[PDB]
Design an enzyme around this catalytic site. Structure first.
Site, PDB file in Angstrom:
ATOM      1  N   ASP A 144       0.859  -1.178   0.000  1.00 52.85           N
ATOM      2  CA  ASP A 144       0.000   0.000   0.000  1.00 52.85           C
ATOM      3  C   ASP A 144       0.898   1.231   0.000  1.00 52.85           C
ATOM      4  OD1 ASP A 144      -2.088   1.785   0.137  1.00 52.85           O
ATOM      5  OD2 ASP A 144      -2.545   1.426   2.249  1.00 52.85           O
ATOM      6  N   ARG A 284       1.864  12.830  10.739  1.00 54.58           N
ATOM      7  CA  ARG A 284       0.607  12.682  10.029  1.00 54.58           C
ATOM      8  C   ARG A 284      -0.120  11.504  10.669  1.00 54.58           C
ATOM      9  NH1 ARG A 284      -1.380   9.455   6.271  1.00 54.58           N
ATOM     10  NH2 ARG A 284      -2.882  10.175   4.705  1.00 54.58           N
ATOM     11  N   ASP A 286      -2.298   8.975  10.512  1.00 55.29           N
ATOM     12  CA  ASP A 286      -2.961   8.179   9.487  1.00 55.29           C
ATOM     13  C   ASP A 286      -4.206   7.441   9.994  1.00 55.29           C
ATOM     14  OD1 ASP A 286      -2.631   6.946   6.654  1.00 55.29           O
ATOM     15  OD2 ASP A 286      -2.764   5.179   7.953  1.00 55.29           O
ATOM     16  N   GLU A 328      -5.576  12.988   9.520  1.00 58.90           N
ATOM     17  CA  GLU A 328      -5.969  12.488   8.204  1.00 58.90           C
ATOM     18  C   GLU A 328      -7.346  11.869   8.394  1.00 58.90           C
ATOM     19  OE1 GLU A 328      -5.177   8.774   6.586  1.00 58.90           O
ATOM     20  OE2 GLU A 328      -6.095   9.498   4.730  1.00 58.90           O
ATOM     21  N   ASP A 393      -3.361  10.133  -2.631  1.00 61.58           N
ATOM     22  CA  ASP A 393      -4.577   9.341  -2.780  1.00 61.58           C
ATOM     23  C   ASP A 393      -5.556   9.893  -3.802  1.00 61.58           C
ATOM     24  OD1 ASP A 393      -4.081   7.213  -1.007  1.00 61.58           O
ATOM     25  OD2 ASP A 393      -4.985   8.252   0.700  1.00 61.58           O
TER      26      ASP A 393
END
Ligand SMILES: OC[C@H]1O[C@@](CO)(O[C@H]2O[C@H](CO)[C@@H](O)[C@H](O)[C@H]2O)[C@@H](O)[C@@H]1O
EC number: 2.4.1.4
Length: 628
Positions: A144, A284, A286, A328, A393
Site C-alpha cells: 500500500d 501525520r 494516518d 488524516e 490518494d
C-alpha cells in the site's frame, strides 16, 4: 487515579540516592516535572474515559511515563529548544510564512541521500514544511505504497538507513524546513513481528489485533462497516490461512491494531517518542477515524478514538512539546472538524475545500465552494487547516449531502456526475482521470490522476495551466497551511506504466504517483513551456503569501460576488480575492463593488485595478486585491 507528584516520585525510584539528588536538580527534570504537572491530568482523564477500571491501566501508565522521562532525557538539546519555542508559540502553524510540500523519497529523489540533494530546490521553491511518504520497512511488492509497516524502527533499505533519515531531518532543519512523517498507528502489515506473534498465540501479544474464529462476529460488524477498498475484499475482515478472520479495514495485508488493549496504546506511544526524538516536527496521524471499534456502529469517529488521540497529544506535551499532529480524516465535514483542536490534532487535512475546488472546475459554479468557505472554514484558536489540491490518494467527493440539499443539490446524483466528468466519460470534459474503487453495491467511486491530468494538460487544453494556478491560489490564500503535491509545480502528468505493473495494476492511485520528471524540471525557468508557466506562477504566489501579512492566520470572510462563476473572500479585512471558475470572461459589477476603495493593487498580475466600474475577469483568472 494516581496524581503527577506520586508518579514522578516512582519514576525517580530507578536511581540510587546519590543519583536521584542530581536528577531532581537537573534542568531536564525541572522541565519534565513542570510539563507533567500541567499535562498529566489530561492524559489520565483521556485514558480513564477509554480504559476505565482496567487492571492494566495503572501498570501501563507508569511504564509509559518512565519511558517518557528516558525519552525526554535523551532528547537532543537542539530539539528541546524547538520544544520551548513552540510551547510558547502555538500559532506557528497559522503563519502565512508556512508553505509545505509532500513527496515519495524513492519516486522524487531515488533515496534519502538523493533527497538531501534536493533540499536546495525545496528552498528555491520556498518550502518550510516537507512531508516524506512512508519510509520504513514494509512487505516487498505490495505494501500500500509503504502504508503496511513491518517495522517502525528499520528504514526501508531501498531508501537508506535510520542514520540517513537523521541526517536528512537535520539538513532540513538547517534549511529552515520542518520534517513531517507518517504515524501509521491504526494498523501494521501482516508481516510485522507483533502480528506474527499475536497470531502465533504468543501471550505477550495477546489481543494486539482483532482476530475471530469464524464469520459470526465479522458478519455482524460488516452490517455497518463502510468499505474503503471494496476491490480488495468485502467488509472489514480478511481470512487467515488457518481459517480464522482478522480485522482489516484497508488491504488484507494491513491488520488493525487493537486499542481496546492498553498495552497497544503503550506500544504505539513508544513508537511516537522514537519518531519524536529523530526530530520529527509533525506526525501525520494516518486513519485517525478507525482506531476504535464497537459492534453496531460504523466503527468510525467514535468517542474513544478522539480520546485516544488527545491522550497521544498529552504525551507529546510532556515528552516532546515540538511535535504537532496532522489529522488524516477523509470523512463527513461534521466529523472532519472534530479531530482538530489544540489538545487533539492541531492541524488536519481540509478534504472539503479540496473536493469542492475540483467540483467547481467541473460545474463552473461556486455555490458549494462558497457555502463551505462561509460556514466550515474558520477553526478554534491555535489550530489550522492543511489546504491542498491533490495528494498521494484518490479524490473523494466528501462534501455534505445535507449541505448540498440546502442548495437543491442531490448528493448521490451529483457525485455520479463528478465521477463521470473527471474520468472523461462526460461530453466535453477536459479531465483525464482514472476510476478508483467503484463500488457496485453502493454506486460510490473515487478519482485518480494528477492535477495536470485532471485539468486537461495531457491533451494541451489551452486553459490547463490557468486552472492549476487557480486551484493552488485558493489553497495558498484562504487561510491555513498549504500543501503542494510535489511534481504539480511543473505540470507532471500520470505515470504511464502502473497499469501493467502487476504490483500496481489493481490500484489506480499509482496513476498519480509519477517519478521525478527531469525534462519538466529542466523547463521550469522557460516561460514558453507549460512547466515554466506553472512553476513561475506558483512560485510567485508562494512569494506573495509568505511576504505579505494580509494572508496571516486562518480566518476568512466570504464576499458575495453576485456572479455564480466567481468565488470571493477577504483575508484580514485587507485582501480581497476573486477567482473565476468559468472558461469564459466573467464580470463582477461596479454595483457589487461600491463599498470597495476606488482602486486596488492586484498582487497576482501586478496591475492597479479600478473597482468603481465593472470588473471583468479573464477565463480562470485570479485576483488578490489589497483593499487595506
Ligand atoms: O480502470 C483502470 C484500472 O483501474 C483499476 C485499478 O484501480 O480499477 C479501477 O477501475 C475499474 C474500472 O473502471 C473499477 O471497476 C475499479 O473499481 C477501480 O478501482 C483496474 O482494475 C482497472 O483495470
Amino acid at each position: 487515579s494516581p496524581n503527577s507528584q506520586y508518579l514522578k516520585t516512582r519514576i525517580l525510584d530507578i536511581y540510587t540516592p546519590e543519583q536521584r539528588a542530581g536528577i531532581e536538580k537537573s534542568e531536564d527534570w525541572r522541565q519534565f516535572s513542570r510539563r507533567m504537572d500541567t499535562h498529566f491530568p489530561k492524559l489520565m482523564n483521556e485514558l480513564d474515559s477509554v480504559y476505565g477500571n482496567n487492571e492494566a491501566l495503572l501498570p501501563m501508565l507508569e511504564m509509559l511515563l518512565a519511558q517518557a522521562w528516558q525519552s525526554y532525557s535523551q532528547r537532543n538539546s537542539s530539539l528541546k529548544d524547538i520544544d520551548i519555542a513552540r510551547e510558547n508559540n502555538p500559532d506557528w502553524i497559522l503563519s502565512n510564512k508556512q508553505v509545505g510540500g509532500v513527496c515519495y523519497v524513492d519516486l522524487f529523489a531515488g533515496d534519502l541521500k538523493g533527497l538531501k540533494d534536493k533540499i536546495p530546490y525545496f528552498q528555491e521553491l520556498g518550502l518550510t514544511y516537507l512531508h516524506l511518504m512512508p519510509l520504513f520497512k514494509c512487505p516487498e511488492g505490495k505494501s500500500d505504497g509503504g502504508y503496511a509497516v513491518s517495522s517502525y524502527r528499520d528504514v526501508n533499505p531501498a531508501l537508506g538507513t535510520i542514520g540517513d533519515l537523521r541526517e536528512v531531518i537535520a539538513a532540513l532543519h538547517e534549511a529552515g524546513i520542518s520534517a513531517v512523517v507518517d504515524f501509521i498507528f491504526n494498523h501494521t502489515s501482516n508481516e510485522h513481528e507483533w502480528a506474527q506473534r499475536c497470531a502465533a498465540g504468543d501471550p505477550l501479544f495477546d489481543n494486539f489485533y482483532y482476530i475471530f474464529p469464524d464469520r459470526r462476529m465479522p458478519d455482524q460488524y460488516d452490517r455497518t462497516l463502510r468499505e474503503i477498498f471494496p476491490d480488495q475484499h468485502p467488509g472489514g475482515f480478511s481470512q487467515l490461512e488457518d481459517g480464522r478472520w482478522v480485522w482489516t479495514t484497508f488491504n488484507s495485508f494491513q491488520w488493525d491494531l487493537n486499542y481496546s488493549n492498553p498495552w497497544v496504546f503503550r506500544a504505539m506511544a513508544g513508537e511516537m517518542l522514537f519518531l519524536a526524538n529523530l526530530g520529527v516536527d509533525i506526525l501525520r496521524m494516518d486513519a485517525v477515524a478507525f482506531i476504535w471499534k464497537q459492534m453496531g456502529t460504523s466503527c468510525e469517529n467514535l468517542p474513544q478514538a478522539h480520546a485516544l488521540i488527545r491522550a497521544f497529544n498529552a504525551v507529546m506535551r510532556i515528552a516532546a512539546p515540538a511535535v504537532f499532529f496532522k489529522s488524516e480524516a477523509i470523512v463527513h465535514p461534521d466529523q472532519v472538524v472534530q479531530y482538530i483542536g489544540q489538545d487533539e490534532c492541531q492541524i488536519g487535512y481540509n478534504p472539503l475545500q479540496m473536493a469542492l475546488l475540483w467540483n467547481t472546475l467541473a460545474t463552473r459554479e461556486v455555490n458549494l465552494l462558497h457555502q463551505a468557505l462561509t460556514y466550515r472554514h474558520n477553526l478554534p484558536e491555535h489550530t489550522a487547516w492543511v489546504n491542498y489540491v491533490r495528494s498521494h490518494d484518490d479524490i473523494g467527493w466528501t462534501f455534505a449531502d445535507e449541505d448540498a440539499a440546502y442548495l437543491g443539490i442531490s448528493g448521490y446524483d451529483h457525485r455520479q456526475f463528478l465521477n463521470r466528468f473527471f474520468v472523461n466519460r462526460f461530453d466535453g470534459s477536459f479531465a483525464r482521470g482514472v476510476p478508483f474503487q467503484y463500488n457496485p453495491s453502493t454506486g460510490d467511486c473515487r478519482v485518480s490522476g494528477t492535477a495536470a491530468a485532471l485539468v486537461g494538460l495531457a491533451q494541451d487544453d489551452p486553459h490547463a495551466v490557468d486552472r492549476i494556478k487557480l486551484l493552488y491560489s485558493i489553497a495558498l490564500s484562504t487561510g491555513g497551511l498549504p500543501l503542494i503535491y510535489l511534481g504539480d509545480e511543473v505540470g507532471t502528468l500520470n505515470d504511464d506504466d502502473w497499469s501493467q505493473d502487476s504490483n500496481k495494476s489493481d490500484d489506480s492511485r499509482w496513476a498519480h504517483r509519477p517519478r521525478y520528471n527531469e525534462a519538466l524540471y529542466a523547463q521550469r525557468n522557460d516561460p514558453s513551456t507549460a512547466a515554466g508557466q506553472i512553476y513561475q506562477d506558483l512560485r510567485h504566489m508562494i512569494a506573495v503569501r509568505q511576504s505579505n501579512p494580509r494572508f496571516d492566520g486562518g480566518r476568512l470572510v466570504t464576499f458575495n460576488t453576485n456572479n455564480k462563476h466567481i468565488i470571493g473572500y477577504i483575508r484580514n479585512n485587507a485582501l480581497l480575492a476573486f477567482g473565476n471558475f468559468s472558461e469564459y470572461p466573467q464580470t463582477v459589477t461596479a454595483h457589487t463593488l461600491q463599498a470597495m476603495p476606488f482602486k486596488a493593487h492586484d498582487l497576482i498580475g501586478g496591475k492597479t485595478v479600478s473597482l468603481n466600474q465593472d470588473l471583468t475577469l479573464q477565463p480562470y483568472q485570479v485576483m488578490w486585491l489589497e483593499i487595506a
